[PDB]
């Protein structure tokens with residue numbers, strides 16, 4: 001029977017942009033989309049513990 | 050992927066096209082990568098239950 | 099030895115399937131070590 | 137010249153041949169899909185032994201199984217007249233020179249020396265290099281296409297122990313590009329300048345396999 | 361301090377006891393190394409834009425440019441632009457650029473278009489995947505009399521659609537009616553070849569069409585290269601390819617025609633030098649995630665910083681000189 | 686609509702460069718003399 005799951009963290013800026021571009025200034029017009037996803041991922045990361 | 054744009058590399062669209070016509074081609078990629086991250090978080094929240 | 103794990107949670111540095119770290123997708127290690135589970 | 141003897145197209149099978157490098161990007165230990173114009177696996181190709189004027193429908197694969205250098209090149213162009221910069225291949229066993237000229241064609245060409253035409257004109261392209269040719273036993277494969285601006289050439293040279301007639305040898309061998317000629321001509325018909333194998337390319341999705349060194353070891357035809 | 365970023369990420373003034381992911385960690389590059397080819401011979405743009413006179417629209421010609429460094433501030437010595445913007449044309453590299461020029465009516469500068477014409481459907485077709493820059497040049501001052509130059513003709517109808525980059529030099533009249541003809545006229549069997557009727561504004565244009573998915577570069581730009589430094593995070597620029605990463609040695613087995621090198625997925629992992637001709641290994645410099653461990657703001661103000669996924673020999677040793685970013 | 690402060694700037698250009706001057710453009714005057722802003726709200730007025 002399975003018990004746990006692989007905990008994954010997602011860097012939102014490094015996934016959407018490429019960490020070498022001026023894309024990071026355009027991602028601030030959305031605001032709270034990169035925080036809700038990592039909050040839900042931190043919830044899974046503490047849920048599998 | 051392109052999501053209906055000219056290229057997938059952001060460093061080509063930034064270094065090729067004209068600043069005020071980049072807020073659609075580098076908006077389609079941003080919305081596509083946001084939808085992909087939301088889809089990934091959605092199926093992980095589904096399969097975590 | 100029969101469960102082939104493919105996680106990307108390590109510190110170490112031809113490339114493996116763990117090149118997803120370079121795109122912003124990392125793997126956190128669990129709190130309980132397998133020696134502690136054993 | 138009017139050298140003419142008595143002339144029936146024979147046929148054989150391509151034993152998983154016609155795979156080249158679709159791009160100059162190095163890959164290693166990966167399976168890559170490519171939707172380009174390739175040769176279909178296990179296709180009927182025209183084995184001659186003969187010089188007719190064959191079509192050039194968006195790509196023609198070529199092969200040659202010989203011991204000597206009795207083959208010398210090809211000629212391309214939609215017209216048989218002195219127009220639209222008809223392309224030429226030639227070889228003199230010390231250099232591989234290629235010309236793109238505006239000559240009017242002849243009936244039976246031979247290059248053993250400008251006897252394949254009778255009127256030189258204002259030429260367009262000149263290129264001299266030690267590759268583009270290497271000189272039964274010797275295999276000489278070729279793939280010609282003229283998509284999106286310029287002219288592609290792929291080749292590979294392997295030894296053959298298999299017999300001469302009716303036998304394209306089985307096994308995998310990747311065709312490497314030599315030079316991308318920036319000419320831009322429109323081709324409909326072509327013929328050779330004297331084995332013989334002609335196969336036509338089709339748009340098809342493939343699945344290449346790259347090894348640790350980056351050579352294509354196997355391929356998968358996704359519509360066979 | 362990390363306590364205030366824990367306050368800002370939680371959007372509160374009191375932080376409870378626990379571990380909180382606040383922000384990320386990225387090492388910034390230092391150098392701005394560009395590497396261009398060796399060539400110095402300029403581009404003959406004065407032969408493209410100026411000659412004795414130009415050519416016809418169906419008897420067109422495309423001038424090839426190879427082994428040259430281009431310049432576009434001298435292009436305005438004597439202009440809408442598609443694809444690549446001209447403000448970044450001074451630092452990009454290609455393999456070959458085509459320069460096809462034709463002549464059109466003053467009421468014909470609007471019809472010719474990649475995805476939109478009348479005369480084009482039958483005299484000069486342009487493909488849909490276009491990248492290039494068009495020149496708008498009036499010639500009413502250059503050519504306006506009863507017979508300026510009789511080397512220019514045009515036809516307004518053909519038997520079918522024309523493919524892009526196609527030329528017909530057939531000395532044959534065409535028809536659009538019902539009965540077949542050969543040389544003789546009658547029911548819609550007249551000549552299609554019409555000469556230009558100059559009277560007092562012909563437009564003589566030059567299209568400079570660029571490419572996509574470039575080869576090892578033969579043409580280049582006037583920007584001068586810089587020396588190559590390894591083993592540190594360098595903002596590089598290799599033949600127009602922008603990026604930032606550590607240029608470590610390859611230890612690879614590149615074929616003599618390959619210059620690009622990729623990972624399992626789409627990642628620019630390896631490149632070849634344009635001058636040294638030595639293959640490299642693009643690796644991004646050290647990054648990770650940060651988690652702050654606070655015991656609670658109601659007990660103390662000390663914080664513990666955990667940089668997730670990194671070694672302890674990759675932290676910045678210049679903790680006092682981190683103000684210059 | 687109501688605004689903060691209207692700014693009127695006058696200059697004389699050629700007949701070929703009424704659209705060449707643009708937000709983020711090059712040529713003769715768009716990168717060497719004048720520059721329309723990237724976030725430019727407002728308008729330009731060109732006439733004969």
Ligand SMILES: *[C@@H]1O[C@H](CO)[C@@H](O[C@@H]2O[C@H](CO)[C@@H](O)[C@H](O)[C@H]2NC(C)=O)[C@H](O)[C@H]1NC(C)=O
Pocket residue numbers: 397398634635636637
């Ligand atoms: C561009 O010119 C430079 C200068 O000669 C070339 O660099 C030389 O490359 C050869 C081998 O490729 C070396 O043996 C020389 O030592 C190099 N010279 C210097 C001064 O470094 C470079 O190869 C040329 N690039 C191309 C594409 O032709």
Ligand SMILES: *[C@@H]1O[C@H](CO)[C@@H](O)[C@H](O)[C@H]1NC(C)=O
Pocket residue numbers: 109110671672673
């Ligand atoms: C961190 O680096 C040191 C020296 O570079 C090395 O000995 C050590 O093994 C590394 N840590 C891990 C977890 O590999």
Ligand SMILES: *[C@@H]1O[C@H](CO)[C@@H](O)[C@H](O)[C@H]1NC(C)=O
Pocket residue numbers: 347348349
């Ligand atoms: C790759 O190259 C090495 C040495 O160059 C060789 O030993 C090995 O057999 C090659 N791989 C394959 C699949 O042939």
